[PDB]
Design a protein around this ligand. Structure first.
Ligand code: HEM
Ligand code: HEM
Ligand code: HEM
Ligand code: HEM
Lengths: 146, 139, 139, 146
């Protein structure tokens, strides 16, 4: 996960504008709606029967906040994502048994949320930088499988 | 299969893309080439730099294929038969790459249609592009 | 789609499996639980140890589903309709896991049918299991 | 890629019995036949039009020998796969641009060849150990993407 300085610049400048109370919940909700097998890991969250029910679920927004915080943590430690995500990798791999393909999916859904929220500002080069980031996070989160 | 609601959602999102379909297809291809550089090898005879007339012309081709699929959503295997042969037999396109372009098409729609790209319409579009990809990889 | 040669090959390989169908399905499930431990979580009410009567009984169910798919190869969406509902809606099986079980079914056939598991029949069986997986993930 | 000693035992014992002149060619051929898009990377090999033509192709047999040799290499350095495969990763990722999902496929195809050749002896535990191995190799060969 080597971002060039231009890549680092594109990523960090957009990230400073992210509403960190909302975007992680938007991404988790879309994950549950677009890829409904992921709802298997979130039965304790209650009503997920409709997209509206998902996106307005307070457990979804509250848990998405923590997810986004982990992405924020990774963005700070691009040179040691393995270390940053070791604890979450044990949780997701050894305890939760989430298939790591779903880490890739959540990363892609996050990218769609950023595109939705930033529009033209989410240029193809900015996307390409974010794709390096969400790939690095998914790989580090999957390290306890590797 | 695609549900009636999915068909409605896809139809309406396509309706709002309008005459930008060709442009958005070109942008999705550029997003794919920059984000997933392995896909570039399928277009050696293309200049893939920004503003390429060849990327532009091919984006329109791709958009027109997707519009034909939308217009014949209940008969996609038949509608896309000739393109399925092309992609599996001649071009030998790795199936993984349809996932990458589908994602980039979603990203392009999200960047351009803020009102239309709700979680439900996002889900329907993903299913539609997955269905197109299944057909194009069927041979 | 599955070609006539594929349908012939699949039918012939299945013919040689005979009354071992139930046992081989059980062995494929065991191979998947051991090789891909993430799949184990879908069966918390099962004992997954070797010789489990519950894995045995489920292996037969799975084999019988595949045999029904072979017997109705030209009409698989319909034949497998009810199982597609079960796997997507109620069980919410991750699509990745169908790839894992398909691979383990191939390994089981290869370990048991040395003469039948030629490269051609291996290709035909992979396409057949991919087709079954596409249907089972269609809902 | 940590194998237990029993996993190491099961892997090494079977591998000593592998016909290293043939098995790599069986695996590469099957890859080209089962996953025909991989033939994109091997157009210089000539007649690939039928399965017999592929399995009987002398260049398929010849190249598969080298592929199997790299697997044999990885089996010797299980606790340092990334270093063993650095040069091949540069080649396959930076030069060839092979999608890494195909590393997984070739590893699964190898496992099918081992099952075919060893039958009953290729027990479910032996398979599970080989899956850890081919997973580790694919991940190491893909490091240049990560
Ligand atoms: C890049 C991908 C992901 C990131 C960064 C991430 C991050 C997090 C974080 C920060 C937590 C809170 C852990 C804590 O309470 O200390 C968590 C918990 C959890 N994650 Fe994720 N996650 C990811 C992917 C996934 C996916 C794809 C699934 C399932 C489809 C999943 C299932 C869960 C579950 C069930 C919990 C709650 C575990 C518990 O409280 O026992 N995660 N994740
Ligand atoms: C949404 C899925 C896709 C659609 C709708 C689509 C559509 C098309 C169409 C309509 C053509 C014909 C253009 C013409 O007739 O001049 C074409 C050609 C082609 N496609 Fe796709 N395609 C898709 C996916 C892909 C992917 C994933 C790849 C590779 C990464 C790919 C690679 C190619 C190539 C190399 C050509 C030939 C271009 C040329 O030589 O002019 N396609 N595609
Ligand atoms: C080749 C693909 C598959 C076939 C043909 C198949 C077949 C079946 C059948 C026939 C049943 C019904 C058993 C009954 O009615 O008693 C069933 C149930 C079930 N399947 Fe599958 N299946 C496939 C793939 C998978 C995969 C990949 C998973 C998860 C990793 C899975 C998980 C389950 C579970 C958890 C049940 C319920 C078992 C129970 O509670 O008794 N299936 N499957
Ligand atoms: C576990 C996966 C793989 C291993 C261990 C492996 C191993 C090797 C080895 C040892 C070589 C010889 C390099 C040399 O001459 O020094 C090679 C070359 C090559 N590999 Fe693979 N390979 C793998 C996967 C793949 C796949 C999946 C593809 C394409 C579908 C591929 C395409 C090629 C090509 C085209 C060459 C020739 C490169 C050249 O001579 O310029 N490889 N590989």
């Amino acid at each position: 996960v080597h971002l060039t300085p231009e890549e680092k610049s594109a990523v960090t400048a957009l990230w400073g504008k992210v509403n960190v109370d909302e975007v992680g919940g938007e991404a988790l909700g879309r994950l549950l709606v677009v890829y409904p097998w992921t709802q298997r890991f979130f039965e304790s969250f209650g009503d997920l029967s409709t997209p509206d029910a998902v996106m307005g679920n307070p457990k979804v927004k509250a848990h998405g906040k923590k997810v986004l915080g982990a992405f924020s943590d990774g963005l700070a430690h691009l040179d040691n994502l393995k270390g940053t995500f070791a604890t979450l990798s044990e949780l997701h791999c050894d305890k939760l048994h989430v298939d790591p393909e779903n880490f890739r999916l959540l990363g892609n859904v996050l990218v769609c949320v950023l595109a939705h929220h930033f529009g033209k500002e989410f240029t193809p080069p900015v996307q390409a930088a974010y794709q390096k980031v969400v790939a690095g996070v998914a790989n580090a989160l999957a390290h306890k499988y590797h | 299969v695609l549900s009636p609601a999915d068909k409605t959602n896809v139809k309406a999102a396509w309706g709002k893309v309008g005459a930008h379909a060709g442009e958005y297809g070109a942008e999705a291809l550029e997003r794919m080439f920059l984000s997933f550089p392995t896909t570039k090898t399928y277009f050696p005879h293309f200049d893939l730099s920004h503003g390429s007339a060849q990327v532009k012309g091919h984006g329109k081709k791709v958009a027109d294929a997707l519009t034909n699929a939308v217009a014949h959503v209940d008969d996609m295997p038949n509608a896309l038969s000739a393109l399925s042969d092309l992609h599996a037999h001649k071009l030998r396109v790795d199936p993984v790459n349809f996932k990458l372009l589908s994602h980039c098409l979603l990203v392009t729609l999200a960047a351009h249609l803020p009102a239309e790209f709700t979680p439900a319409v996002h889900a329907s579009l993903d299913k539609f592009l997955a269905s197109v990809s299944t057909v194009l990889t069927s041979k």
